[PDB]
Amino acid sequence: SSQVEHPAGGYKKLFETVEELSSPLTAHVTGRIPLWLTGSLLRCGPGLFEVGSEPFYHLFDGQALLHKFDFKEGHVTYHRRFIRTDAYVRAMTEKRIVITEFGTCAFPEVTDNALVNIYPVGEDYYACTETNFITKVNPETLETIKQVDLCNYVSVNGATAHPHIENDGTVYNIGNCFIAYNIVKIPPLQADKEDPISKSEIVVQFPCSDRFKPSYVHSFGLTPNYIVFVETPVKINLFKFLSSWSLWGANYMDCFESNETMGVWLHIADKKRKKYINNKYRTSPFNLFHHINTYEDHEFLIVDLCCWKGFEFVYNYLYLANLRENWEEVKKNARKAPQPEVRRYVLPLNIDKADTGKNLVTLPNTTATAILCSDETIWLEPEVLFSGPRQAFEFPQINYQKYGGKPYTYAYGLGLNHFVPDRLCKLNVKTKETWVWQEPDSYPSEPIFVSHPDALEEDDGVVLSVVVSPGAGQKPAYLLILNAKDLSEVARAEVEINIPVTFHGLFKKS
Amino acid sequence: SSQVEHPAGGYKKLFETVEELSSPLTAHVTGRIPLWLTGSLLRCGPGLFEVGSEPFYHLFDGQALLHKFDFKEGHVTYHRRFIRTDAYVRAMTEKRIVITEFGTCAFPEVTDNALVNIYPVGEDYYACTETNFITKVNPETLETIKQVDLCNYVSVNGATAHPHIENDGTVYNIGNCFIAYNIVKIPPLQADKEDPISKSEIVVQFPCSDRFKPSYVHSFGLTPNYIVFVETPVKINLFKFLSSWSLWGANYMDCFESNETMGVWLHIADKKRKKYINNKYRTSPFNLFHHINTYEDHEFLIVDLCCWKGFEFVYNYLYLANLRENWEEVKKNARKAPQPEVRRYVLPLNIDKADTGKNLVTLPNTTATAILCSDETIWLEPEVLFSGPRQAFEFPQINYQKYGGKPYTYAYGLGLNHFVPDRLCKLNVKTKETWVWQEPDSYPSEPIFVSHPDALEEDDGVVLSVVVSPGAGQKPAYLLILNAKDLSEVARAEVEINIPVTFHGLFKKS
Numbered sequence A, B: 001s002s003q004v005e006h007p008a009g010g011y012k013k014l015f016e017t018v019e020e021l022s023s024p025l026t027a028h029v030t031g032r033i034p035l036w037l038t039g040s041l042l043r044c045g046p047g048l049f050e051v052g053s054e055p056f057y058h059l060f061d062g063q064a065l066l067h068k069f070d071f072k073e074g075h076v077t078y079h080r081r082f083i084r085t086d087a088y089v090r091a092m093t094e095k096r097i098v099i100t101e102f103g104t105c106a107f108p109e110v111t112d113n114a115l116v117n118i119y120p121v122g123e124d125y126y127a128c129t130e131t132n133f134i135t136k137v138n139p140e141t142l143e144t145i146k147q148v149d150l151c152n153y154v155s156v157n158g159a160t161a162h163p164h165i166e167n168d169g170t171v172y173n174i175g176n177c178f179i180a181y182n183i184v185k186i187p188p189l190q191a192d193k194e195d196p197i198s199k200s201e202i203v204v205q206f207p208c209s210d211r212f213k214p215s216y217v218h219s220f221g222l223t224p225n226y227i228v229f230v231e232t233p234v235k236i237n238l239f240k241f242l243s244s245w246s247l248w249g250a251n252y253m254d255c256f257e258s259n260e261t262m263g264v265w266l267h268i269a270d271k272k273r274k275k276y277i278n279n280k281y282r283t284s285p286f287n288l289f290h291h292i293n294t295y296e297d298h299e300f301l302i303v304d305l306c307c308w309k310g311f312e313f314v315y316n317y318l319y320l321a322n323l324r325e326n327w328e329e330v331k332k333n334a335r336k337a338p339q340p341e342v343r344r345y346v347l348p349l350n351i352d353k354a355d356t357g358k359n360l361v362t363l364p365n366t367t368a369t370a371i372l373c374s375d376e377t378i379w380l381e382p383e384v385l386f387s388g389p390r391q392a393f394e395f396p397q398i399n400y401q402k403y404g405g406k407p408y409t410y411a412y413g414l415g416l417n418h419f420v421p422d423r424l425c426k427l428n429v430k431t432k433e434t435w436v437w438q439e440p441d442s443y444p445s446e447p448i449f450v451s452h453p454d455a456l457e458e459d460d461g462v463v464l465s466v467v468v469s470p471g472a473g474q475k476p477a478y479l480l481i482l483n484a485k486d487l488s489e490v491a492r493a494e495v496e497i498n499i500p501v502t503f504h505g506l507f508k509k510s
């Protein structure tokens, strides 16, 4: 949990327009930047929160800004450029809001505002949002290369900002199809050197709980042998979605509703046999954005999730007007929102009818349960790993390359305090011990883990976070490097300009 | 959690017949019994697990044995006597099992085998089970005085072994009525000196979820202004219950079944206005035996519970044959049982329709939620206070006289390890810190708190537990005194004879 209030309102700087740079700045280092840290931290976020006098309304509406911190020989640079999307380019051309964003209807066509994340496919990097358009970008210059329409290649209406990436470069993602949820597989770059997106395929399909209302989907789980998909009660109303949007004046946010009675349905597919498995896993209602990690342990799937307890769409609390309120009002507004909680669910793969009415979760080191009912639904209860009053352990990251999809012990996260990011966290998922890093009037980003090259242990490395530190006596922002063992500070690299909120990203080793 | 295995099987001594004493034994003290500790620890349990060659089958079948440790001027005695119930007396007379017990059908009429608890009404003390018969006993000699049939006074078929006792001596309890659950109020002893049981009344009534199947009920919650009842999916099948029992050969255990679809329904009544309040609180399935404590905080009820996650009846795992198995087999048997978990539920008293779809739990220091649905059910999620793999924090006790029904911080409990009692626990319900007391091959009882008589703080006192320590190198049993602050040992009082399992009891100040 956080141990801090924010009466000064410095968090408002997360949602304030900035300018791009024409070339990299030097970042003033204090402490010691590890000499083995060589490469680029690449992150996305909104950077332009109004076009002239026309305002963007929602957290996810501001125009995509691609950020880069470079690390070489203990020295750091910072650079940023707006992504030249249709949304941005046409807004600059016409000097108004042209494309409808998530929560901002444009007055008189799908957004490609790639403000959320960035990931590799073959030798390329793509910025994304959650729509059918991803944007190829140059990871060294931050130039925008190409718009790619996933619909030209596979049958999906969108795809998440959280694809899983296997060690050979294979990319998996999930997307709505208008009804199913399709898993897309993009193969690694092959000898022929042609673009791996042109070899995309749907490998497996998950069914939908309601023919006319698909669930919103933000991420999914992957193990060597299984794919896990969590169907939440946040639904997309397709009657509102597929009508004339500039008639009645709609945006994406206007098309969501909550199903009060379904709870959550969890789904598994066989990854290698490409086959949906018909186990009716059921539990109580929550929103889910980020899976932490998933793994196989005997005949069981361990599914670790950042949950929000309730069926109301958490995105309702993320209009900019609310996030720009003063501290007492920010807290008041979040009182009735769903409560964040890290939960471990355990999914049995061997369902014996003879165990009807009992708990199937026979593993020795969890309190998670799974009850086989007579209708063959399997009712799940979680083991809670972390729970704090409006204190979210969010934007989770692990040592992904070596532990993604596998037995693991540690996760790192961004700590939200009534939705305001004010700390960095580490959770031991076996023991539930936590570690916190926190300074007054400091607003960090998702922490990203980078392994030490001679690491023996899961947490032998650092985490990198971009921190916004407003109010003079300090420089506006900095790159924070923390030791992954105990979250003690190793270094920081201060810059002379503001940085707004960023959502996701990656470290690119060079 | 426990840190101990039990390969020696010493826990079997908890379920072995003992002989009563004709007068008190001296208990050899080591360490220093507090000089302000003056009075008697009174506890009930089974003491006779077979009649001749006819065996009792279930944990709750053995014949009631009343235990007493006396404390005066740093010296301790121990005494025990079988309760002269109809079950016991007739078994001694006829030299066989005459009355059907909970899980033991008698070959050829309700049991009054008062093996569970003991409590005060006016100037009297009554041993109880959960039936319509309670047994008046003498707290100084341990003589049995008389049988009382609650049906002669109030309309109930039974009553729990966990009445609440207000500071003036008022007694509240709950019982099934064959359909409702009735709250019985027994007033304090008045000037006229007549037995307060003759002034018993039903003050309020809780409705039943199923006309033909009432829920099993073990305890309930009480605050200055409210009564809380938790209706679980463990049901009593009245078609099986009310048929001729010695025809098809039935016992009490044979009449229980689990409703797979209702989950848990929570109920509140206005204590002072004597009125059921019609709020449809709903959550997922669990068994519940013991409420820890209940209290009012602004317009909310805080409801702390020892839960078992699942709908299967936990009492199915408590046949003596299973509890007498070897350790590896005990653990194996408990793998599919419900998982124990301490949970805090929070019940809003102000339901505004304008908040439909949202979390009503606006308190600042909980993660518990309560969601108002369109059908007006209020779906609850808990804040988990303690969770360990088959490690139950059970038989909870608090500083009851000063904190029962009120804001509080500390609970004490008996720690079960795959149902085997092997430690004593303390839980801070605000911070979730725990403290443990544990020795190898030692099997404690429910801890009971005694305040230092001039204490101003909540945990300024001691806990008392009766501990079975088999295997030579030690005396068979002892009374354990721990400091309530940190569970560090203060003293023990060893006795030369075995003591079997005991369930509940009290400290009687003299």
Ligand SMILES: NCC[C@@H](O)c1cccc(OCC2CCCCC2)c1
Pocket: A060, A101, A102, A111, A116, A129, A130, A131, A132, A157, A158, A159, A161, A176, A236, A252
């Ligand atoms: N990560 C926050 C949401 C944001 O990425 C976003 C911004 C703009 C549109 C949008 O749409 C999501 C839908 C796309 C089509 C298929 C259904 C989901 C989603």
Ligand SMILES: NCC[C@@H](O)c1cccc(OCC2CCCCC2)c1
Pocket: B060, B101, B102, B111, B116, B129, B130, B131, B132, B157, B158, B161, B176, B236, B252
């Ligand atoms: N504490 C463990 C259960 C035990 O007290 C017990 C032993 C024997 C009979 C019995 O009956 C409970 C029913 C009484 C009538 C009303 C329904 C519950 C209960």
Ligand SMILES: CCCCCCCCCCCCCCCC(=O)O
Pocket: A059, A116, A161, A289, A314, A318, A394, A416, A419, A420, A421, A444, A445, A446, A501, A502, A503, A504
């Ligand atoms: C760094 C963000 C701070 C302000 C917003 C915090 C509220 C986050 C709520 C949970 C996560 C929602 C998903 C956002 C990340 C994404 O777009 O992938």
Ligand SMILES: CCCCCCCCCCCCCCCC(=O)O
Pocket: B059, B116, B161, B289, B314, B318, B394, B416, B419, B420, B421, B444, B445, B446, B501, B502, B503, B504
């Ligand atoms: C000291 C008891 C040890 C053996 C039984 C442990 C299993 C207890 C399960 C939860 C509590 C059930 C109620 C027992 C006490 C009572 O009858 O009131």
Ligand SMILES: [Fe+2]
Pocket: A161, A162, A218, A289, A290, A504
């Ligand atoms: Fe995300």
Ligand SMILES: [Fe+2]
Pocket: B161, B162, B218, B289, B290, B504
């Ligand atoms: Fe009990």
